[PDB]
Design a protein around this ligand. Sequence first.
Ligand SMILES: [Tl+]
Ligand SMILES: [Tl+]
Ligand SMILES: [Tl+]
Ligand SMILES: [Tl+]
Lengths: 95, 95, 95, 95
Amino acid sequence: KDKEFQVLFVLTILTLISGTIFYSTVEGLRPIDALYFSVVTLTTVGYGDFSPQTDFGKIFTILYIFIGIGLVFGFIHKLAVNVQLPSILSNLVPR
Amino acid sequence: KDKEFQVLFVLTILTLISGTIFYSTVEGLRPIDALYFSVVTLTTVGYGDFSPQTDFGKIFTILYIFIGIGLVFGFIHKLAVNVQLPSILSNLVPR
Amino acid sequence: KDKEFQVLFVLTILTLISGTIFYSTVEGLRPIDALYFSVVTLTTVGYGDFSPQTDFGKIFTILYIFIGIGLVFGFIHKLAVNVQLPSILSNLVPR
Amino acid sequence: KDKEFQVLFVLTILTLISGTIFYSTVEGLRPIDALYFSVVTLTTVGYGDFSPQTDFGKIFTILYIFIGIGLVFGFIHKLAVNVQLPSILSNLVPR
Ligand SMILES: [Tl+]
Ligand SMILES: [Tl+]
Ligand SMILES: [Tl+]
Ligand SMILES: [Tl+]
């Protein structure tokens, strides 16, 4: 459960690293903005304060969403049910 | 079921209070706009009428989404299946 | 299954009617824009071409999302698994 | 499992082709922008860099979201659990 979470954590980080490199390079964003935009994209928030301006960027974003959404939300789910929930229950009973 | 819903309700409120304080303070939003933005972020609507302008804000928003989405949608689900649904079924049969 | 879908269909329509009336009135949108915005909000797309400008509107939108998301996506799911899927399978076998 | 994925893949492509044609034609987008916008809409990212300006476009987008979200996310799920996951597990054991 903990190994599941480790793996999804690593996969998420690698996905976000890929987006940070791509958007910093092709769309010219500061690395911090590239990471932020990658996260806002794959969690489907999509503020649109950054959005790809190049056709290269738009095509990559299509593929990045389709490949990355499933991973991000798998990690969010496991983080919910395997880390946050136990800590919440545990806080419910003094020791 | 009702205690489950109570807990998720409290956790959601606390999460939204955290975002309201942070965005009011660091991003200078009116408290009402900070709450509204927090909700629009964690439900993944993301209009982008407010979005963080500071690097502090962008980093916090990354973490806030990852930690908060799972909680908000747990609460929405329980609110759907444990409160709204019974009332809907109950309205279906006169008394 | 068909009655389930009927009910969720009616509930969705009523929810969207509520948003259309509210946003047309309080935020001054054309009714068509109010419906469009209501749909874009509750499906969490959130383009932000329309977003509430009044505090009344922002508070209503907070509550509307929390109460309406669960309903809309229940309807989308049932529409997926109970209407679209059978028609797709049925198209797979000539008659 | 592979046939399931094939079918959802074809259905997704057809849905995106429909949106590309419609938005290129009625909203005057370049085909590439129409595809990009279709994807950003049905995955619920919704940057809003493109959004429909015509009433025809707004009405179509309402219907497109309701009919298309369920399909897209079915495909993303199957792509997650039926293609990405096995490859990830398989990379975990040298051969
Ligand atoms: Tl958005
Ligand atoms: Tl937006
Ligand atoms: Tl979303
Ligand atoms: Tl969104």
